[PDB]
Amino acid sequence: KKKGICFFCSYIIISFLIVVNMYIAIILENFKKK
């Protein structure tokens, strides 16, 4: 349904977001290092 789904939708943005934030820090470092 369309209610009861906001924590689960929010967890999927958050779960996407931790990898994305960490990757932008490591792959900026590798570009910079090179």
Side-chain angles (χ1 to χ4, degrees):
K1 71 186 283 205
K2 305 199 48 178
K3 287 182 183 313
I5 56 165
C6 69
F7 306 107
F8 302 120
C9 295
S10 296
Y11 198 78
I12 302 146
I13 316 167
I14 295 304
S15 297
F16 281 119
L17 180 73
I18 47 169
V19 185
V20 160
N21 281 12
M22 209 181 182
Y23 174 61
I24 76 167
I26 298 172
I27 202 56
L28 172 62
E29 180 59 52
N30 289 263
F31 186 92
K32 205 161 59 57
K33 181 181 181 90
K34 181 74 245 189

